[PDB]
Amino acid sequence: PWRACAKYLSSAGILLLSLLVFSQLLKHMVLVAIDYWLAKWTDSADQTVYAMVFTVLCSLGIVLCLVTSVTVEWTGLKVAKRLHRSLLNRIILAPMRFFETTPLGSILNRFSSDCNTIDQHIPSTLECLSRSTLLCVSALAVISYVTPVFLVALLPLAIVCYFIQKYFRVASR
Amino acid sequence: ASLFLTAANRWLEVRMEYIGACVVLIAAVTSISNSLHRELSAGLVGLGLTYALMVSNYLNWMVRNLADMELQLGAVKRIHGLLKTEAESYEGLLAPSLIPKNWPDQGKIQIQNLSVRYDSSLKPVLKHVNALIAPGQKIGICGRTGSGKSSFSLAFFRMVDTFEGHIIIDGIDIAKLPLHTLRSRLSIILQDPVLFSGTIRFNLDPERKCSDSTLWEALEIAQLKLVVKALPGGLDAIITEGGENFSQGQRQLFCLARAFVRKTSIFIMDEATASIDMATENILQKVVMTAFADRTVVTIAHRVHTILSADLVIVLKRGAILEFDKPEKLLSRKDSVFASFVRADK
Amino acid sequence: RAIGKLPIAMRALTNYQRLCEAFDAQVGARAIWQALSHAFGRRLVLSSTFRILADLLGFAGPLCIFGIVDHLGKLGVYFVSSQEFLANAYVLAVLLFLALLLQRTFLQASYYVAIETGINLRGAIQTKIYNKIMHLSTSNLSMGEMTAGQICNLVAIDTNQLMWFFFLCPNLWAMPVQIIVGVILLYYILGVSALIGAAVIILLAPVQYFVATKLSQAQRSTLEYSNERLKQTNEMLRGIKLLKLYAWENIFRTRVETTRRKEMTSLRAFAIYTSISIFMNTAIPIAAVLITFVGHVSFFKEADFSPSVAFASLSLFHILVTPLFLLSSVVRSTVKALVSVQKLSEFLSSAEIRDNCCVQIMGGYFTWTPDGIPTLSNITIRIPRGQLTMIVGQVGCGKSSLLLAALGEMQKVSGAVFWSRGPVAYASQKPWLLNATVEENIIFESPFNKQRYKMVIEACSLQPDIDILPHGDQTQIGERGINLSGGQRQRISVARALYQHANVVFLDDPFSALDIHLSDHLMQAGILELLRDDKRTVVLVTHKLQYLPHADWIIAMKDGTIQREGTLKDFQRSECQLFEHWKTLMNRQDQELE
Ligand SMILES: Nc1ncnc2c1ncn2[C@@H]1O[C@H](COP(=O)(O)OP(=O)(O)OP(=O)(O)O)[C@@H](O)[C@H]1O
Ligand SMILES: Nc1ncnc2c1ncn2[C@@H]1O[C@H](COP(=O)(O)OP(=O)(O)O)[C@@H](O)[C@H]1O
Ligand SMILES: [Mg+2]
Numbered sequence A: 001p002w003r004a005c006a007k008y009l010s011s012a013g014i015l016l017l018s019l020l021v022f023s024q025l026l027k028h029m030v031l032v033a034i035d036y037w038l039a040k041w042t043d044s045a046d047q048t049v050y051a052m053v054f055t056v057l058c059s060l061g062i063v064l065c066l067v068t069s070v071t072v073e074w075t076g077l078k079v080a081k082r083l084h085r086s087l088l089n090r091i092i093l094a095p096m097r098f099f100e101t102t103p104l105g106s107i108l109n110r111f112s113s114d115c116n117t118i119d120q121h122i123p124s125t126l127e128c129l130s131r132s133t134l135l136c137v138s139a140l141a142v143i144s145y146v147t148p149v150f151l152v153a154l155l156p157l158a159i160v161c162y163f164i165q166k167y168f169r170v171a172s173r
Numbered sequence B: 001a002s003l004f005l006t007a008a009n010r011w012l013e014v015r016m017e018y019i020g021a022c023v024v025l026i027a028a029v030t031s032i033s034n035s036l037h038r039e040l041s042a043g044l045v046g047l048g049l050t051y052a053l054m055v056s057n058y059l060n061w062m063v064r065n066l067a068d069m070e071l072q073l074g075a076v077k078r079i080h081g082l083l084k085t086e087a088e089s090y091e092g093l094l095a096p097s098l099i100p101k102n103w104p105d106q107g108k109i110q111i112q113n114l115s116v117r118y119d120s121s122l123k124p125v126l127k128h129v130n131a132l133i134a135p136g137q138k139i140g141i142c143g144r145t146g147s148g149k150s151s152f153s154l155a156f157f158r159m160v161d162t163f164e165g166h167i168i169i170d171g172i173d174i175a176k177l178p179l180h181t182l183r184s185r186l187s188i189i190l191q192d193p194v195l196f197s198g199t200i201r202f203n204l205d206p207e208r209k210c211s212d213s214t215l216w217e218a219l220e221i222a223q224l225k226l227v228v229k230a231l232p233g234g235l236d237a238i239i240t241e242g243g244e245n246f247s248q249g250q251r252q253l254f255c256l257a258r259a260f261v262r263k264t265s266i267f268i269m270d271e272a273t274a275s276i277d278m279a280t281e282n283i284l285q286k287v288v289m290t291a292f293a294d295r296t297v298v299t300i301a302h303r304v305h306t307i308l309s310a311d312l313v314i315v316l317k318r319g320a321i322l323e324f325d326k327p328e329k330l331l332s333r334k335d336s337v338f339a340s341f342v343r344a345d346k
Numbered sequence C: 001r002a003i004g005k006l007p008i009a010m011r012a013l014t015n016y017q018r019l020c021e022a023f024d025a026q027v028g029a030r031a032i033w034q035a036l037s038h039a040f041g042r043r044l045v046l047s048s049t050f051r052i053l054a055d056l057l058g059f060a061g062p063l064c065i066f067g068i069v070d071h072l073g074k075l076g077v078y079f080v081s082s083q084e085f086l087a088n089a090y091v092l093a094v095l096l097f098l099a100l101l102l103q104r105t106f107l108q109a110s111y112y113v114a115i116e117t118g119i120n121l122r123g124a125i126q127t128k129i130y131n132k133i134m135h136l137s138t139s140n141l142s143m144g145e146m147t148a149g150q151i152c153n154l155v156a157i158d159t160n161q162l163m164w165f166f167f168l169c170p171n172l173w174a175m176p177v178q179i180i181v182g183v184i185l186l187y188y189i190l191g192v193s194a195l196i197g198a199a200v201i202i203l204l205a206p207v208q209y210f211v212a213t214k215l216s217q218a219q220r221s222t223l224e225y226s227n228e229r230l231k232q233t234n235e236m237l238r239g240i241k242l243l244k245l246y247a248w249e250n251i252f253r254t255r256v257e258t259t260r261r262k263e264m265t266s267l268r269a270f271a272i273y274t275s276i277s278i279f280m281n282t283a284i285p286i287a288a289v290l291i292t293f294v295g296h297v298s299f300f301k302e303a304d305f306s307p308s309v310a311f312a313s314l315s316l317f318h319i320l321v322t323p324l325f326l327l328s329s330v331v332r333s334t335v336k337a338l339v340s341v342q343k344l345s346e347f348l349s350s351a352e353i354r355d356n357c358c359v360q361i362m363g364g365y366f367t368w369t370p371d372g373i374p375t376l377s378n379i380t381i382r383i384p385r386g387q388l389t390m391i392v393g394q395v396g397c398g399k400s401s402l403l404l405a406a407l408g409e410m411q412k413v414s415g416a417v418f419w420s421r422g423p424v425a426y427a428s429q430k431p432w433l434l435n436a437t438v439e440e441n442i443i444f445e446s447p448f449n450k451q452r453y454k455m456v457i458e459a460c461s462l463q464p465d466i467d468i469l470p471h472g473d474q475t476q477i478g479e480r481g482i483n484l485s486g487g488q489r490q491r492i493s494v495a496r497a498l499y500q501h502a503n504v505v506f507l508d509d510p511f512s513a514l515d516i517h518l519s520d521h522l523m524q525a526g527i528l529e530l531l532r533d534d535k536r537t538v539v540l541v542t543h544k545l546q547y548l549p550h551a552d553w554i555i556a557m558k559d560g561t562i563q564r565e566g567t568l569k570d571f572q573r574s575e576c577q578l579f580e581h582w583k584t585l586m587n588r589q590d591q592e593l594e
């Protein structure tokens, strides 16, 4: 964890961030509850309580998906606003000795491509990152639920995941 | 480099999805072993097999979006590394109602033992200079290149830092002033032509404060009214980016016309008579010495005959004032620096 | 090094040779797309057929669910049958594992060949953009119509947008075959209860039509406001010295804040339609399980609610839902490719270039504008071999434009051009620098010879300026590296145009940014010393008429024409009003000009 995710969360604040983590967490917990109620429904052999609980829990799933999509786009618009209007107002008060030292295309490259990355490319990647790793840890949680024998198998796959990830990341940088 | 970054990014994902297919196999065989000789359910085995298929569907998106979040978080780290830069401290030490409304009523520029550097680690570019200018005086400064003559006009505006010396204008020190009040009530014109796009009426008036009468008089006194009247915008003609609709001297004359809008008592000039022709330069010298007759003008001369009609000539060499007198008093004396400047011309 | 060299089929000039052969048999943006499909159809259909072969092999997942938990709910004496073989959980798990290994390695091969196609596309259209640049006239840049930051913004964020579209488009090509064979497998597992869910799968066409057309005009207005913002920021920060000295930075900050405000309005529109595209693309499968499980136990005869068809349908809906998530980024990069090809074909249809004496322009007419009155009228010049000439005029009277007509950068309305065109050495009124070393700036890909290099340094007196530089001669200057004086880069640009060994040396005001002493050193150790000894033809417009006695020819210009050419005695003989205007201007009234 670097300082840039700390400045990303400080520019996001607390108010969108609590809804950001908790709408995603209940948005995956409603889906784990939906197919856990389906796995209660498959051992039938009490009738039409299961389909009504299924209907109201997928209504809870579609409203948590709704509030998840507008909270990731609301923090995308808020950090797309507030990482401008401070960079501009802290490069507009810079001295002339700063411009005489630094190359000008570096500052214009910061104003073009990195601000383009911040408004466009970051919050869709943040949605697929949060949704992919929260589906992944809900998958690991519910595969630890159905068997205890996967919990002694989880340690070689995680140690080869950490070893192959560190051994790759020293080439990838 | 993009192909090797590509083949690394497919190598990691082909190993990690091989590990994910092995996760499908080991969850499959322990769930059918625990449903073979024990009893879980039917549906719990199908749930565990389904989410074992889901973690092989989503492990590549976990590792690829973690790498993309690192690679796109580096831009946030570079924007934050730019964002921790310094400032200029635009608000001064003097109180903002200590100044009058007409602050530069006249020119009483007192140079009292001034010396500047550029940065904190290099030399004093100017040594200890001393001058005081009467408020009608159309004085000039000549000297060699690299003498600090552009740097003294930068030292009027505190662009460079004044580590010793008290430059006092009208009884008010320059270092105790707000900088927007300083650089709004004082008009430099640079040697280099800097011209934005948009149009002429944007370019002389960026903040919509002047009428067209004083703008057309500013185009008349910059020897420029005929080409703006020939070009069919009629003050709304498009100058392009960098001023490349026009010539280099036309860019210089447009920069001088943007200097002529803001009526201050001091029009400090650098060599804006550089890179124009001598006929319109001398006609422009007679125009600015009929127009700004009450105003103090201080010029840096590129040519040494437009400083010949000045009130006083301050020849600067290597940081210090060498000569400080009337131009014919510096001409009629000893074979000096100003006499060799006018001698090496003709 | 040891990344190494490249393969010959992945070379640019082999790529763009295939695109120029695809540019033939075309005799527009649709022609650009037809040349791109004819150039790169084969590797793209290899990528798309690897995504045919994966994800149809991906539908052995829910087939193995339908094997395994249907099994767990439950001569010809040592032989097993095929129905006995394909209803056993261990061999169905091993077959699931082999099918998932082969499906993930075919997905990785599809992603590799699509990114290799996009990399070769990026190399071919980068050198196609450059081959448009080397024929491009300055008149489509000087009077508007693009900026240099916009032409760099092409290769910055349009070549990469077309590259990311060629990354993403096999998912566009092999999305709907996975949709139609997946709904046939939904019909195979549980029948007509899944045909209710076929209605919410066929309802993606409003949210691929209306949402994407709203995103299309939102992204077009976004890129128009962003090019306005980048052009205003680039013209802000180059003029930061005059912008701070005039205290105009709050006005220009207000101007770019209003441009950022209109760009944030279009970002709000693009944001809201992207957020409802993400909401519809993740909200239809969770509605699809609701309508198939209310169509299972209501409105239809309950034929088989097994666990097998339930978890086979939920795993089949999860592999019907997991390719569906990418589609907002697919239509994002699709419409950024469409405006990329539209602005690229707008750039690629721009206007282009067309007696002991070198240059013999006789009767020429020249215009900056494609459709305007000519800035240069009828000119008749003769520039003799080995001799200096000078162009003397006022401001704005055709002096640099006479050189730019003689280079060929001006368009030629009428007249004739006669040379000997050879290589002409030239340095403008605005000096031009590279981001290499100062020794690479002076030499400019010539052979380095230190005697001539010392002759052109100490001719134009650069040695204290090299001595003040921190790495000496090996500093890199320009836009990167270290900023310079303004008087340094004028001498660097005219010291580049003495090392050329070119017979015609054009100059466009070298004595602007210098004093009298360095101009006297260039007049007395640079020009008239090195160039008389080679007998190189020099052309030098100046206003410094003290050096006009050192002239073999004088061109006088006013108002786009030439008034007279010839020598100083010819201007003494008959152009005596201009000669006495020069005599009153020069203040050598006691003496003569000769
Ligand atoms: N890049 C350009 N695009 C369009 N028009 C131009 C351009 N440059 C110059 N012009 C027009 O052509 C005329 C001649 O300008 P020219 O190019 O000769 O500069 P110049 O007169 O040599 O400059 P200077 O007097 O500063 O040496 C000018 O009046 C100007 O209006
Ligand atoms: N931006 C700068 N930063 C540091 N040093 C500079 C800068 N500009 C100029 N100098 C140095 O200070 C001296 C100032 O001279 P200057 O006013 O720039 O030109 P002139 O030769 O017209 O006096 C020059 O010799 C130069 O070496
Ligand atoms: Mg200077």
Ligand SMILES: [Mg+2]
Binding pocket: B247, B248, B249, C399, C400, C401, C429
């Ligand atoms: Mg010119």
